[PDB]
Design a protein around this ligand. Sequence first.
Ligand SMILES: Nc1nc2c(ncn2[C@@H]2O[C@H](COP(=O)(O)OP(=O)(O)O)[C@@H](O)[C@H]2O)c(=O)[nH]1
Length: 227
Amino acid sequence: RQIKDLLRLVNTVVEVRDARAPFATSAYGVDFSRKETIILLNKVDIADEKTTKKWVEFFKKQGKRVITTHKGEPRKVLLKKLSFDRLARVLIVGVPNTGKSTIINKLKGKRAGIQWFSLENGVKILDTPGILYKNIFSEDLAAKLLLVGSLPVERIEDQRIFERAFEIFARSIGIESSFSEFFEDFARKRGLLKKGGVPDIERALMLFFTEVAQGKAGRVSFERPED
Ligand SMILES: Nc1nc2c(ncn2[C@@H]2O[C@H](COP(=O)(O)OP(=O)(O)O)[C@@H](O)[C@H]2O)c(=O)[nH]1
């Protein structure tokens, strides 16, 4: 209902998280306690390498099965990292925009009611990923889903979420300047002005957060295990 329907069909789950925020992009709530579970930390190419290294050992130390990967990693390498049992049947699960379609497409690759596809050794993978929508109870979670592009900028009505998101960004990257200074500067630098040469702060926020989520603002992670 409806990930609960799909879980019934599988014995293996691949949890596709964003490496920049492994906790905000975890599939909390939904139950994989009786499935073989691989934690996939994705988008390592746009994450802070050192932070990602900390996340790996954090999961390994917990006894958990964890891998890291990104768009540009070869299909062969991903498959080896995955190392699926020959009798695995697989659900790819996660929050929106975390790289699940891209992963399915690479595995697929492409070759040929709920649909499946098969790997060369016959392991079966569900063609469509289970999409997980979270109760956003904290503005911190909303901010973190914004930063990784799970929560699109068009959906943000509350300016406090933008502020929390910046505050997380700023701490991660080392910025000590204020919300106002930073966004005025960003609007200026990118020529985002309205009549009278007034910095368009709203366009600024929209472009900046779009760019952060795409990894265009640098290799930055938003959660640390330390923490
Ligand atoms: N930099 C980077 N971008 C990625 C990676 N995987 C996916 N993306 C991008 O993330 C966005 C969402 O990817 P998509 O596969 O459609 O996400 P989905 O909603 O989970 O299926 C797209 O803009 C992709 O181009 C990755 O490993 N690295």
